[model samples]
Target: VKNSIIWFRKGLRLHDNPALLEACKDAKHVYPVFVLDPHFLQQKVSVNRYNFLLESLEDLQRSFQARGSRLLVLRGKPEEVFPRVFREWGVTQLCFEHDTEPYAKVRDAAVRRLAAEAGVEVVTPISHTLYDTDMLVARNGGAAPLTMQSFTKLVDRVGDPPAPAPDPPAAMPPPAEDMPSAAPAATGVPTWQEVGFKEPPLTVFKGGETEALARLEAAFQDPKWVAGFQKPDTDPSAWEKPATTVLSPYLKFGCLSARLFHARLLEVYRRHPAHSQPPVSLRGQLLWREFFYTVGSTTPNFHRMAGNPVCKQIDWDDNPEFLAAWREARTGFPWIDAIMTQLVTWGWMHHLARHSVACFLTRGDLYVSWERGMEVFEEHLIDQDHYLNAANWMWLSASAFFSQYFRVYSPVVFGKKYDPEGRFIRKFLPVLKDMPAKYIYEPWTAPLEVQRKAGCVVGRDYPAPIVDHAVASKACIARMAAAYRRSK
Candidate 1:
């Protein structure tokens, strides 16, 4: 009897999964496994992210069990685990989704070599992104398209991404009758504490393909909403409910299929002839995701400014105090601090909210390295993808892909435009809950008597503005100009 193993990584869901389908084909027995690599386990991941992964794994496990199979939760490095499993189970075939991040490329290559030596046929399908990122780079003259215009042109030439694969059969191939002694017990998904983290407080987002599909369906129900959607127009200050489809984390984890999303959006556009177009449209947002992946995959040292061909050579400051203040949500700017507070607690934030904070951390105020800011986000963001996180950091800092250093996001003015009442601020920073509408964004500027009346003195109960935005921003811009000149 043929035996196959489907190694689950970023592509956690069973639906529209080419690798999962391929593993079960013509196989008498199939094993679904997820390896908890210690390399990632040792990193400083937030409890929320851990919980999200566990939930996703548990959901996948349930789906497999329902189809007469089980998900094996194994713990070890993939290189070590796969060889042992291949020998123990007499595995003839291995299947997994393609991952394009720098670390993943190396790790996957090592695993592919191991599988080849063991005479196991490897099947890796690319379903993580809308298009095959490598192909996009290849077609574009062997280099990544640096601008959105160029990327969109390449996408136009390539046409649409392949349609999503069909869901797996209702009755999946059964697991082997006898378990090998050397193989770890099929001890169901572990608890948060077992995974070395405390239980996370519940947030708006939930993990799993079941949840992801439901959200996707709900969002698409209103064709008017879908057809009219624009990335930049979404209200970031609407904290009670997000203005945009908060489906990014699902997409990042591969709970939702990108191709499936594109197909659905296309359906809506067909129905409504008067819909929005690229760069700002929903389809354009997915393309933006594709753009980042292409650049991140092709560019060496993508996450760093130094030695990175695309990123500008900027002498960023090494101020630990400034970095700490920003990370700890004590930047003394209500809008900035509130966004950070929301980020740590929710493990997510609106796209524009992210822009404001990232701008402030890098070019707008602190003049600190974007790398420092990226690390904090990598730890906290539920939707954090290596490519997108690094690419956006460079973009926000005006280090790469973007060069409008002069147009800085005002820490106070930007938020007030969306939320004049400071309702979003009050929700996250309850210390300023009683602050009046006029002084909510700039609490320190309020008279002492007004501050007392608000029940939170600026310097006492909360922090005063850490740096004068007006003064710091001008200096940061000058420094950016100097860096650009030096680059020439």
Candidate 2:
């Protein structure tokens, strides 16, 4: 009759969870508890992270209750609370999933130490990444994923993971003891009232398990998934499926474990590989997540990784006008505008846009640090994985991981090419929605009469081209060259 405590953090779902699974295996009764750590409530949290967590926790509470397990919502840090809970329940051991975020690492280690001193066992299971960091180290012969090619080869050796098993019938759960009879009105999570963000009127997404499953089914069902992986058109006025899983938010929130996703993706890959293409390129993306997670987890100062180290030495734009246009997506350049708009709207953007926009910002707009830009990404993006986000931005800004290659994303040319006919640019910038195809990507160039007919007015109607592309590109090339020299 051992009492088991499932110390839930990011691992919110009961399905496909190794930690909860192990707890149920050994215990006669289990308490699924969630703590609202103070770290998230402070100003330190980005807007998107705050929103995602609230929605994810709500979904998790519902999921657990449905499965004959009540999620005991608690407040206060684990260090301050676990001891009291253990004393009250005489809990034999605690069970939970492991996380790799630097802060998570520090907190978990402290919890384990405290539990050990209390003479209680604290067991943990791996469920976050496609490959367990520990297991990856084991297979790499005590090494971790240092490079993408090496990682893919090592992941191949691990073989494909097992698919999700159908959910089992839930047993009757015991009533709450020393736990709240009902969920408190506050999770200390922000609501519409908490954040002042007006959340601009547009087509947006839902959050949590319900939303996660719904998006998953919808993604597979849509013909867009049938198309291929491409940077999604961010324009609200236009209609494109955006060729994405939209599962990134769910994964980021720990509503769905990465292992579950990897299993499903592997199934999809095995069924369609070298023979046919499916709408999902999940395996490749899974590896991408793994590659970045590995890099960040292994590197001691992952967030502080500045490309060229001396790239910060370059004089960046201190001009408020330049920063405002770039920040707000009023840059007058269609491609740059497209990516920027996506950030503010859906609270998410495509990976390609992330890399390209980061380059454009640093090289084209001349930002002091990609760090300044990452704050914007973190504030807006639902799937903002820090290591990947930071790595890509740094690489584009000064080329840290790979060689020095300055990728200039010409908004006009890129729009004319990838989204020729200005389909994508037109989607978000409705003022120029009807602008003639040729001038749509470059609105300011259109004759005044044509501009009127197109229902577009630069500066007044929309925004004037922030800076001519050629001038910016020339400055961009020189800045990149200087940064490269500084790094060497």
Candidate 3:
């Protein structure tokens, strides 16, 4: 019997999966396996991140079952597990979607070496992005494009990404009958305790291809809306459902294939000639994601401020107290605090909201290191892409990718611009709920009587602003200018 194994990693869906379809063809028994790494189980990963993963896995297993097959879930490092799996199951082939993140590159290389030694034909296909990063680099004179315009030029030469691959066969072949009983029964998706962590509340954003496709469908149903969608026009303060598609978590996990999404968006744009275009458009957002992948793929130490050629080195505040306030949503700025609160609670945030808080932490208010902010986000964000997270943090801090270091987001005025009514502030910072619209963003500005009338007093009912915005922002700009001159 021709036997093969599909190793499910980032690509967790049945629809538009080239790797799965390729593995199923000309195979008699296809064993689908997901190995839980010992490293992952040993670490104290965030409860929300781990829970989102668990839920995604459960959804994947269900997809397999619907197709009359089972997903063999195991626990161990891939290097140690694959050899046994290859030998015991008489596996003739190994297959998975290509992963380009730093750690993934190392891990996939080791796995490939093991497969080669075992005489198993390993097939790895690039399916995650619209265009492969390797190809993007090659086309752009062997270096990652530094700007979106430069990146767009390279993409134009490559032509549009190939049409999304069709979904795989309706059913997969059965697992090998010789499968040993001792080979660990496939327990349902592992529990928090099973992975050495305690359970946390489920994020408002549920994981799974089921929900992902539904979201895509809903977004496209309004062609005019989808066509005219522009990132800048969206209100991050409208947290109930931000104007932009809240599909990052899904895209991050490969629940929604990028190619399929791009193709659908293109189809809509073609039908609606007056629709929005790139940079701010939905398509531009995808390109921005693509740009980061390319840039992060080539830049060394992309996640840090030290020894990174793209990032400017700067001595920043090492205040534990300030960092703690920023992390715990106690910065005493209603706008920044609300954004961070939503982040910790929901594992997500609007893109511009991300910009405001990131700026407030690194360059706008605190003058802390971008690295510090990146680490916090990696821990809390469900939509955290290794490359995109690092890239965005860098951009927000004005460390690289973006200049204009003097442009600062006013924690007070920025939030009020989009949400002058203060409804969003009231929702997250309830102490400020009864405060009037004029004083909501800056409760400290309200008089003693006004504060009393609102049933909330500044510095008592709510913590006072940790730093005066005007004073702190001026200092931050001066510091950044000095740092920039020295770097030059």
Candidate 4:
């Protein structure tokens, strides 16, 4: 009798899970396992990220229980744990979703070697991304398409992503009951404190496949809303209620299937007939994720500036003080600070909000390394993707992908246009809640009397602007221009 082990990683859900389905076919016993690798656990991850993960695991366990199966939770490195399980459980086959991150590549390679040595058949299905990133790179003449237009053309050439696989039957194959008693006991999912994290504060976004599907259904309820959605037109200040579908964290965690999301969007567009197009539309947003994944898989040193051929080599300043202020949301620009505050507290923010803060941290004002900003984002962002985070940081820093150094985001004027009244600023940075709309974006500009009348003095209750935007931006542009010339 063939026995299989379905190794769960990012593709946490059962719906459209090719790997899980593969493991079940013709198997007398199918074991769903998640290895809590210390490599990930040992990292300085945010508490909220940990909480979301645990919650997803809980949901997954429940889903498996409903199907008369169990999700076996194991604690150890995969290289050590998988072989032991294979020997003890008599696992003849291994199945897992394909992963494209740099770290994942190394880890999976080692696991594959171990599985091969143990004489276990391996089936790795690509379902995390809309398309196989490696295939996209090969189709692009062995180099990832650097521009969205070029990427889109390549996508057109490659045709549509594979249709999502159907969900497993309601009653899944029971897990192997004859597992040796001495085998690493299947430790069920752990609590936050069990994993050495304090209980996380309540967040607006809940994690799980159930929540993801619910959110996706609610978003697609209105065809008009789905049809007209544009990333640039969405309000960055609407933190209380984000304008865009906050399905990003779900997509990142693979709680929602990208292929399924893509198919649903197509269904909406077919009915509406006049839906928005790519590079900005909902479909375009998914494509952006695919674009980054494709680029990230092929690009060496994709996460860093050094030794990364695609990244521009700018002499970024080593300013710990500036980096700390920016990370702690005390940069003194209400617009920028508010965004950072939302990020730390809520673990998510609007895309433009991210752009504004990223620009300010890098070339706009502080001129700090995008790498530093990337690390902070990696630590906190609930919806963080390795490829997208690094690529966008480079884009906003004018270090790569985008080279328009002169186009600096005015921390003051940019927010004023979207939030003319600075309501978003007031919500996050309550210290400036009483400040007038005119002074909200730039509290330092307000007269001392006006500041006093508002019950908050700029330099006392709140901080003054960190750097002069007009001066700092100009100097930053000059340095960026010099870097560009040197690159040639």
Candidate 5:
């Protein structure tokens, strides 16, 4: 009896899942499996991200069981696990969606080699992005796109992405009848305690496809909102209500198919013809995602600062204390501290909020390496993606893809522009809640009388500004200018 195994990775949902569908089509028995790679586990994963993944897997398992199949969870590297499973189940084929992260590329290559040795046919399809990033690179004369404009022009030439794949089949064929029929016991989802981390507090955004589709539907229900969906125009201060569709986590986990999203968004735009268009539109965000996907895949040392052709080389300050302050949300600037606190607590942030934080960490005040900030983001961001996180860091740092080192975001003024009353800062940094609106962003600036009135004293209650932003920013800019000249 021939069998096929669908190895789940980033693509977790059934709708628009090509690898699962293709595997089901190709075999009499289809086994779905997800390997808990130790390498991933060893990394400093935020409790929220771990829980989110576990919840997503639990949801996927139930979905599989409802369709008369089981979702198998195994612990080990895929190369070893897949070989054992293949020999044990007489698996003839292996299937999975394509992933292009630097490490994922190497990992997938190893898995493919192992499968070939076992004579197991591999069926891998690109389902994570709207269009295959490899195809995009190929179209760009075998090089990754360097800019959004170039990427946009190239994709236009390649034409529209193919429509989304159909949902899971009505029924997947059962495993071989000859084997012992005892179903594998569910290991149950692991708690943060089991994974060497304290359980994270509740976040507003939950994982799984059910939640994702609901969000997409809710976002589209307001035609005017969808019609005028401009990311830049959205208020970063709107924390209780996210300014944009918070479908990023779902998109990153493949709970929502990019193609499905693209198609549905287009349908909405057609119905409401006055919708804001690309580069800043809802559609532009996805295109930016694609641009990074291609760029990240092709660029060597994409995740780091050294040895990358695209990144600008500047001598970043090695201020470990400042890094700690920034990460610990004790940066002394209420606005910057609030955003950092928001990140660690929520496992997400508004795009602009992210930009400000990233800028602060790298170029705004501290002048630290973007790589350091990138890793911090990777640990906490529930919506973390291979290319997007790193690429955005570079952009914010003025290291790559963008060259606006001079146009720094003021950690204080940037927040105040959108949140005049300091509502966002107050919510995230409760220590500053009682401060006057004028001094909410600059707590240290408050007179002693005002500080006492607010019930939060600077340096005693919260923290004093770690560094003078005005001086540090100018020095950083001067260093960057020197680096730029040297590079030239």
Candidate 6:
């Protein structure tokens, strides 16, 4: 009776799940497992990231249960758990997808070594990345990507996306004989108490097939959304309610497969050939995601952005008060405050919101790497995709070559452009509700008499702008210029 263990990492959904698919092969019994590693739920990751994983896994387990298998959720170090499980279950093969984080790399290495010593074969595949890293790295001649444009352009030559897998044949199955079969009394799934997670905040879906299916249906059915998407570049600036597909949260959790997403985008593209713009933007985002992953995977030192050597050379002021305000959304700049507020409420932000907020912290503040900014944002975005976070932060911080030019953004201009009407500001800072649109952008400017007249008051009813944007902007620019000179 050959047996396998599907160590489902980030890939929580069963559909198009290579880890699950591989485990259910020519075997009478397979252990469908998800190690409830302590680091996952204990806020070792950002607060929102923890919530997203919990929601996804909770959903993934139930889906497995419906299929007569319970996700073998356990706690403690995988090295201890995997070997014990191997001995107890007589597991033959380890089936899991690759993860490229500092912790994950170390964790996988340890598991592989222990599993090898115990006579088990571990098969790791790249299911998360849309564009394969090995393929990209090999094609790039295996050094490193110094610029994003070079990588983005190379994507045109990566070939058609991987075809979606067919519906399951109900072929090979899990160790449990039936759905109600009492789960293994010894090494089995835990009750929520044993799982020891607070009710996660900010996930609309439990992140398995149920939510995936529902989200997919909802996005396509909304006539308003469908009609509004005119081009491939439905960015955060798009006027439609959901002008862009709200798929990143799902994709970040691996609830949706990239190949399937790519195929679906193409399907939509075929319908609106003139509407190729939206898919193109989304694909660029996907490729950007992969570019970071590739960099993160191969890059040696990952303190800032995946083995970035430059960050070590420069001194970064990890100012706590400023970081705390950014974290708590009290930055007082309307757009920054608004976006941070949205992330707290929804556990997600528009891509532009992420860019804008991060830029304020890095560019608008000067010398503060947006990479550090992302470390904070990660705590907010429940679906904080790490590779994208680090790489893009580096890009936004001018830490990446492609984003050096655009990295220098003004939080003021960004507000004037995106939140110009002050709708976003009012939404977040309701205390600024009565202040006229003129003062909304810079409420600190309102005199005490003016504040009383407008039914708004600064530093009491509303927060005084923590740092004067004009003063801060000037100082930030000076610091950045000095840094550039010093670097030169």
In order of appearance, the predictions have TM-scores of 0.97, 0.85, 0.97, 0.96, 0.96, 0.86
Which residue runs does candidate 4 get wrong by more than 4 Å? Answer: 38-43, 178-186
For model 2, the run of ten residues with the poorest summed lDDT: 230-239
Model 3 lDDT, residue 299, Cα: 85
Best by lDDT: 1
Quick one: best TM-score, which candidate? 1
Question: Lowest-lDDT window of 10 residues in candidate 4?
Answer: 178-187
List pairs with backbone clashes in candidate 1: none
Model 1 scores worst on lDDT over the 10 consecutive residues at 179-188
- The lDDT per prediction is 0.89, 0.66, 0.86, 0.88, 0.84, 0.67
The number of residue pairs in model 4 that clash at the backbone is: 0
Per-residue CA lDDT of model 2 for 32-52, tens digit only, reads 777765444443344555666
Count of backbone clashes for each model? 0, 3, 0, 0, 0, 7
RMSD, each candidate, Å?
Answer: 1.4, 3.9, 1.6, 1.7, 1.9, 3.8
- Please list all clashing residue pairs in model 3, or write none if there are none: none
Model 6 per-residue lDDT tens digits across residues 368-454: 656567766676676677677766676566555432432455666665765566776676567777788777777778788889998
- In model 1, what is the error at residue 17, expressed in angstroms? 0.3
Measured on C-alpha atoms, candidate 6 has an lDDT of 0.67
Pairs in steric clash, model 2: 225-279, 235-428, 459-464
Q: Where does model 3 exceed 4 Å of error?
A: 38-41, 181-187
Ranking by lDDT: 1, 4, 3, 5, 6, 2
lDDT (tens digit, per residue) of candidate 1 on 1-488: 68999989898898889999999999998989888853466566887877888889989988998999888888778898898889888899999999988788889999999999999999999999989888988898888889999899999999989999999999998777677623436446886777666565455688999999999999998999999988888999987879889999999999999999999999999999989998999999999899998888888899887889998888899999999999999989999999999999999999999999999999999999999999999989989899999999999999888998999999989989889999999999999998899999998989999999889987789998889999999999999989888866
Tens digits of per-residue lDDT, candidate 3, 1-488, equal 67898888898788878888878989998888887764675542577887788788888888888888877777778888888878888888998999888889899999999999989998888988888889889888888889898788789888999888887778788676657722435534676667777666557888888989999998888899988988888889997777788989989999899999999988998889998877888989999999999888888888887878888788888988888999999888999999998888888889999999999999999988888888899888999888899889889988888889888989999989889988888988888888988888888888999999999988788888999989999999999899889865
Worst 10 residues of 5 by lDDT: 179-188
Please, what are the lDDT tens digits per residue for candidate 5 over residues 1-488? 56898888989899999898888985789888888754566656787787788778888878887888877777667777777778878889888999888778899999999899999999899899888887888878888878888888998899878999888778887665444321364334455566666566466788888888898899888878877888888888888888989899999998889999899878878888888877888888899988888888888988888998888877888888988998899889887888888888998889998988888888778988888888888888889886899899989988898887799888878988888899998898888888989888888888999999989998899899988889988988887778778876
Relative to the true structure, candidate 3 reaches a TM of 0.97
